[PDB]
Amino acid sequence: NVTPFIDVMLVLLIIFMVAAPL
Amino acid sequence: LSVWGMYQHADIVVKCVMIGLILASVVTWAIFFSKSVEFFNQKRRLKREQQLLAEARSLNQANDIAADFGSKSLSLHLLNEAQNELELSEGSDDNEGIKERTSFRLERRVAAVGRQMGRGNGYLATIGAISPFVGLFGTVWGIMNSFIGIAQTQTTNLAVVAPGIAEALLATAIGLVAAIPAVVIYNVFARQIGGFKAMLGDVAAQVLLLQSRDLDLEASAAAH
Amino acid sequence: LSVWGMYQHADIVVKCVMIGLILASVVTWAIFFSKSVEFFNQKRRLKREQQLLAEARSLNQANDIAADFGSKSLSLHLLNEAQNELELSEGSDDNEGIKERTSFRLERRVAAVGRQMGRGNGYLATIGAISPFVGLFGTVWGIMNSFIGIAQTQTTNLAVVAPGIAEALLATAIGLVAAIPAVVIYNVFARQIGGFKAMLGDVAAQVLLLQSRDLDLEASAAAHP
Amino acid sequence: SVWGMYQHADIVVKCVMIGLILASVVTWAIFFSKSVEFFNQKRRLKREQQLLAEARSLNQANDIAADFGSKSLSLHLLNEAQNELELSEGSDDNEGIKERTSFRLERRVAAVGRQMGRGNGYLATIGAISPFVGLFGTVWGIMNSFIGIAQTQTTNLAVVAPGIAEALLATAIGLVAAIPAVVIYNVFARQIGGFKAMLGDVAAQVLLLQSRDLDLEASAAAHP
Amino acid sequence: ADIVVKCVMIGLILASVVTWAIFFSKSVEFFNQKRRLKREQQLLAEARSLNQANDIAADFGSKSLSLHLLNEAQNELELSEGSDDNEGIKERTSFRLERRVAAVGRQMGRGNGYLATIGAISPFVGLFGTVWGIMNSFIGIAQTQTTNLAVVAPGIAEALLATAIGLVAAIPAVVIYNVFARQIGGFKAMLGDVAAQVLLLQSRDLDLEASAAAH
Amino acid sequence: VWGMYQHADIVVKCVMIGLILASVVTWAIFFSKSVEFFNQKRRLKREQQLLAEARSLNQANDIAADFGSKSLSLHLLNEAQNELELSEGSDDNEGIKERTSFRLERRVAAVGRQMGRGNGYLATIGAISPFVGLFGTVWGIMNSFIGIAQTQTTNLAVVAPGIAEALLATAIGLVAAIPAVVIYNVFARQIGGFKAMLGDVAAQVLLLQSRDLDLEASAAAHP
């Protein structure tokens, strides 16, 4: 029911990706 | 990439994920087509036979109205069940018992026919729930090979990760395409189950009370 | 850049998704306003009428009071159902059977009266549930198109491709905008379910007790007529 | 700066967060009031149930469950009982009354639930969906942060270092309105559910008492 | 390679082995039950007396669930001896069925919530595996100023392997539970059909007692 | 390190220890209810073998007499004899039973309310513990963003201890989450087993006293 907010961690992975080219 | 490019831009395991999601999508679209047009037929028949059976002032009159429905009326077989227990409780002066005895019989039979059509529920509901999680597997596979591509470069920019990013996002989007219409038309069809099967239960209570009032006549008015 | 310069620039699929979210929101607002106005018409009107009918005390004075409610008296139509059963009670010497035949008939219509307004509910409630997931697919669509666009040559520099990701996240934004008050509106409609169905079930049991005590008079007080 | 940490991102996000905190405060008032009210009820019905399990007759129940203070719900149950006793007048049918009267109290028990059933949507559902509100506020803040990244392109390192942290903080205030509020109706089920037992016990018991009191007619005052 | 993330993954795979073993046993048993019940349902649809109910259910072997329900029925035939109350028994006996049949369903009630909730929370324990892995990666780069995420890229990949096997265990357990509960509904429905038929058989026979003594 | 245990924050460490101490409280709940229904399944197994063929209410009493004073069957026989003492003078056998039965069944729910407590802890805490961990993540990454807006390099180990304590919050939320809902599903199977079997015993007593009141309503009638 309240499961898919592992997508919030996927957003955190997007943040991990924008930290990369720096 | 290109058309054949984006065919090849996803890896063959990711491609298997894509084809599995889209094939499950299309076969449950066919399931959707079947349910939609069959419930369409059933509710137009519901509308016409409801207008035909609301006027049934006698249950024998209701048998007469069940006759000119075609042989494939559910209500015809319910009146067949009614005459069946008229012949099985043939000899039952316990008019007080029979109908209760009949009712739950009724409270299975064409409801089970309704519980026929709830067979396809797991397809829509559960496959639409798990399809983003299939997309999660696609992300795991694509970002694992993206980490392989980083370890081949150690450049840590968008170029060394980005084709695996595109493959994982392709798997994610196809998981969402296989996700959302399945669960939402699942909820549509379950609401159709509710409305249609409820009005079928209304017709069932109508028949129950037709027989209930006629056996009250035979019990107390034919006493007198 | 400007919102039109961010918006017409964005993908037309995401644009169609967000406008579908806003149009389903308009449908939801219309349905909410309708149920709200109609339900308080029911609440105020049939609340004063409930004060009238809870001590109507005769079941024919229940008919007489519900006669002048206006045409929208659901309760007078249930009284018509009761008189219908009285017309079905013709010849029925058994008072006790009638009552059972009476009983569910009220809660055959009444929840149907509930399903008078039962339509539209699962629609907008499940819209309010699953709309951010629709916006999530909008994000995956937009970010997927952007990160194919920076992967074909292949380039770098997220900062010059980031507005595509923002226009993707606008889909999740409008999905949440539609998502919250639709769930809110079905929760307050479930409070309407509670208030209306409970109160009119009180009215139903009131009529049940009126005609039930009247058949008790006909079976036990008229046992010594 | 600390007030700089207040004033980094935006004021619409501030408005959303303080709306979360104000809904939290009014539902705190809901929790506190229902808590002290149900303690009054629990201590009351605790000693009342002690004294009324030993209420060996319904007249002894009218004696004991009177006061107890003048505001006992059980007093209104005795009022409804004597109401239909006065409405039992004329009909010698013991067998009908009680049945109907059963669900009278049970519908009154529904009213008892409908005593406190109103307002729980605030507590439980706001506790459920507050991080989703903060999620949307975070979507708002990160999209504005991406506008800021579009303002200073070719370098996205510290263009938005603090401000995204404010939007996430919006989720945090969604998080600060997430946990206990759901829990509150969980609280405001459980021994309240026992209350759904407890008071729903005893008048039922009184029903039983009255049932046995009708046996004190139907088995004792049956033959004059 | 790593061991604790591997411990989580082999917990996933061994729970999958238990789940597939349960699925195989249940599914083969359910085929036996349902095709046997198809034939024996065609048989007992016209079991028109309680004696005919016993006689048609006689050739089923001792593995008939319904034969023990005929034993249930004959048990309260023998226990209701001495009193003339036909009228109570039936409801009670109905409720005996409302015990026994549920017990029959509860006969398979054990591993259901197991594998259902296993398929539910398998991505959550895979999430814990990747939390463990990425946290150990950032302990590995907990120095002052690092760059080059390739020094933590395969560690996060091995962390994602936990989410992968979490998904692998997550899908078919919830899937097979929904299938099994669906034919829990179907098979309990047919068994309740059988129970209702037996209740109507004995109900019509007690009505022929109360009416043959009347007529 | 010991400094790495209190690293950069202690209130997120406070919610770590809050999660695992609520875990220990519900572990006490777990092992208590575990050995409880262990004693209950052994006892009610033996007592089931005893009172399955207690041919009378007198045999329902006397075959329950070896149970000790701490059997629930003793309380149900108290309920039955209570309705016998309350139906003194009641020639209507036919009513009593219904009036008796749901007494039992409210008592049966009281049976569930013998351990209605503790359950919401395990179930709801095992649901929402990673959301507590999620607030721990948001707290930790906001503090790390304070740090990398103080440094403004924003790469790469300057975010790393905040990321590590955010994942530590996640991990303690997960450790609190999974076995708690696991143990409530175990306890729901305890609900099913004990509720069902004790309801079998309740139906047994209702059948016994039902047949005995039928023998009283047809005592000098069938002969």
Numbering used by the authors:
A (entry chain F): 19 to 40
B (entry chain C): 10 to 233
C (entry chain B): 10 to 234
D (entry chain A): 11 to 234
E (entry chain D): 19 to 233
F (entry chain E): 12 to 234
Sentences from the paper on this structure:
It utilizes PMF to take up diverse compounds such as iron-loaded siderophores, haem, and vitamin B12 through outer membrane receptors. ExbB has three TM helices with a large cytoplasmic domain, and both ExbD and TonB are predicted to have single TM helices and a compact periplasmic domain. ExbB and ExbD together form a proton channel, and isolated ExbBD complexes show ion conductivity and cation selectivity in vitro.
Five-fold symmetrization, however, gave a better map. The rod probably corresponds to the TM helix of ExbD. There is insufficient space to accommodate more helices in the channel. The arrangement of the ExbB models in the ExbB pentamer with one ExbDTM (ExbB5ExbD1TM) shows little change from the crystal structure. The crystal structure at pH 4.5 and our cryo-EM reconstruction of the pentameric complex show a central single TM helix of ExbD, which makes a ~2 Å pore at the shortest diameter. Thus, the structure of this pentameric complex suggests a low efficiency, blocked or semi-blocked, energy transducing state.
